[PDB]
Design a protein around this ligand. Structure first.
Ligand SMILES: O=C(N[C@H]1CCCNC1)c1ccccc1
Length: 93
């Protein structure tokens, strides 16, 4: 059975106006800006952006990749697909 989301979990993350996007739940570094309540720091592969999202917009990667893990025209998307498959836990700083 599922747990709550935790740092390191791999997802597709849904934002308004964009396709479901390869992403991971990030840690919050000591000294860094915390997310609002009930939100998670989401690191988007490919664009290397962070947004704060709640679970409604977070789809576990394994379950969802057969639907969402196909190439897309959008800037950074296919790079993102490579990262989540090949080195999802790397520093992209
Ligand atoms: O909207 C943002 N991310 C989208 C763009 C496409 C890939 N990731 C989802 C975003 C977040 C924070 C800073 C700037 C932009």
């Amino acid at each position: 059975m599922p747990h709550a989301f935790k740092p390191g979990d791999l997802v597709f993350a849904k934002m308004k106006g964009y396709p479901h996007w390869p992403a991971r739940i990030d840690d919050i570094a000591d000294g860094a800006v915390k997310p609002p309540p009930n939100k998670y720091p989401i690191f988007f592969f490919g664009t290397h952006e962070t947004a704060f999202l709640g679970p409604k917009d977070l789809f576990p990667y394994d379950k969802s990749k057969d639907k969402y893990g196909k190439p897309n025209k959008r800037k950074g998307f296919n790079e993102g697909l490579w990262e989540i498959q090949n080195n999802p836990h790397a520093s992209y700083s």
